[PDB]
């Protein structure tokens, strides 16, 4: 084997500006080589070499440039890109943003060092998601369902209970069961969460007793802004190792993706890169791809990576660059409405903008019922007509609702009342909920229904 070499320690640091540390007289640099910077005080922090030109090197330190002296700090070039020591033993533990074990436990004994930002899967070898998931919440499963390998985020403005919904989904996560070793292992990324939210996550996960199959990658808002960018990379790399290289299906969760967007914006503004819309970097689409575009099923392996991000519209606007690019990349949306929260509904899922682009394959005959697609389409389409009827009633009066419009208004009322609402710990099965969905569709006459054929639901029978 090629003989090893001890990393060269330099002291030629010849410039500091912003978060970027300049070096000179570097002997044979390497792009994206991880360099750990030791200050004169002796404290150490990591960093990446962003731009390599000639014998120079423009390093981006992690813990901040503060305290770096141009004649007393030393930089050591490890000569290798960032690598996360993934291992099967990493399950049931908590790690910092960069991966420091923070559960008062010994560090990870790596089964294999794996580089973050792993290469893409050859789409010829890529396959298609073909199985539903039993998260434990009615409205997500019944309409705009989630497939074992499908990516889909949660759109929810600030202050909404989306964190509680994520915790409930993670604690109640399970297969359809229509096995425990390959059962759902949950990788729970936490980008830029509050300390109270962090303690809540830790306590809730420890309480459900599923610590044996859940990994927390916590990154608080106190941690450096650049260190938040590598947290999703590490989480997804560990998920890739667990799923493809070990077998068990992984249900990747990342909270506050808007925090990741803000971290990207801050890092880009630091280096003065070309800005896209709203001052975000012009390559944000590619970065959000490298984060999201890993969920899927690989042909030769029995693993599967399901992605459930959690975004937050900053101004409660769907047109914001982060949610817009996500919706471009994320293959569907599960939407949460503040207006429904104003009505004191615990799971404020609004179904009008919520669609799963892979639902057309999750449904079928192996699972669910043969009337799933048509019933979902009707409860998706008649809601818009009910909203239009409500608007007409608001702008004209109660007399505007004719013998047909009043039916749509009553449909909307009952749909928002009974169907959407669910218990904080209710595992409402599909058929029991689909019966009430059929009742809601049957509030309207069985002949005015245009899109659905009568025979489709007629195959199913009430009681």
């Amino acid at each position: 084997e090629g003989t090893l070499e001890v990393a060269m320690e330099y002291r030629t640091v010849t410039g500091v500006a912003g978060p970027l540390v300049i070096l000179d007289k570097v002997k044979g640099p390497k792009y994206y080589e991880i360099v750990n910077i030791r200050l004169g005080d002796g404290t150490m922090r990591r960093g990446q070499v962003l731009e390599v030109d000639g014998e120079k090197a423009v390093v981006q330190v992690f813990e901040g440039t503060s305290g770096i002296d141009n004649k007393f700090t030393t930089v050591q070039f490890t000569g290798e890109v960032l690598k996360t020591p993934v291992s099967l033993d990493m399950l049931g533990r908590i790690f910092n943003g960069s991966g420091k074990p923070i559960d008062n436990g010994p560090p990870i004994l790596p089964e294999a060092y794996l580089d973050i930002s792993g290469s893409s899967i050859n789409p010829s070898e890529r396959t298609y998601p073909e199985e539903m998931i039993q998260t434990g919440i009615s409205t997500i499963d019944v309409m705009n369902s989630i497939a074992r390998g499908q990516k889909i985020p949660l759109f929810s403005a600030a202050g909404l209970p989306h964190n509680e919904i994520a915790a409930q989904i993670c604690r109640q996560a399970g297969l359809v069961k229509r096995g425990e070793e390959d059962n759902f292992a949950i990788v729970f990324a936490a980008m830029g969460v509050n300390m109270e939210t962090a303690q809540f996550f830790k306590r809730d996960f420890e309480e459900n007793g599923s610590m044996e199959r859940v990994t927390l990658f916590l990154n608080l808002a106190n941690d450096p802004t650049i260190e938040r960018i590598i947290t999703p990379r590490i989480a997804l790399t560990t998920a890739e190792y667990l799923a493809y290289e070990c077998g068990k299906h992984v249900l990747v969760i990342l909270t506050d993706m808007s925090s990741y967007a803000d971290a990207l914006r801050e890092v880009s503004a630091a280096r003065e890169e070309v800005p896209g819309r709203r001052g975000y970097p012009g390559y944000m689409y590619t970065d959000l791809a490298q984060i999201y575009e890993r969920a899927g099923r690989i042909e030769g392996r029995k693993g599967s990576i399901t992605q459930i991000p959690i975004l937050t519209m900053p101004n409660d606007d769907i047109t914001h660059p982060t949610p817009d690019l996500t919706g471009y990349i994320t293959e569907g949306q599960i939407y949460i409405d503040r207006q429904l929260q104003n009505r004191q509904i615990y799971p404020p899922i609004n179904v009008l903008p919520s669609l799963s682009r892979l639902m057309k394959s999750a449904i079928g005959e192996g699972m669910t019922r043969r009337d799933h697609s048509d019933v979902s389409n009707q409860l998706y389409a008649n809601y818009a007509i009910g909203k239009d009827v409500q608007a007409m009633k608001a702008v004209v009066g109660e007399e505007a609702l004719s013998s047909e419009d009043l039916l749509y208004l009553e449909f909307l009322d009952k749909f928002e009342r009974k169907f959407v609402a669910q218990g904080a710990y209710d595992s409402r099965n599909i058929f029991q909920s689909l019966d009430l969905a059929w009742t809601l569709l049957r509030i309207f006459p069985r002949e005015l229904l245009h899109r659905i054929p009568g025979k489709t639901l007629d195959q199913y029978y009430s009681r």
Partner: protein, 52 residues
């Protein structure tokens, strides 16, 4: 009859017209400041980089 007509007009103005205009004002503000102002700084920043 007159009260019904006036109430219809008032409700239409409150619901449709004002809520139509205000998003238009927000979009116009975003298009100017969010793009033109950002581009102007970026253009000048690139020019200063060229000079340096």
């Amino acid at each position: 009859l007159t009260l019904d007509e006036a109430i219809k007009t008032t409700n239409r103005r409150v619901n449709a017209l004002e809520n139509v205009v205000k998003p238009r004002l927000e979009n116009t503000i975003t298009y100017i400041k969010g793009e033109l102002d950002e581009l102007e700084r970026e253009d000048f920043f690139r020019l200063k980089k060229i000079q340096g």
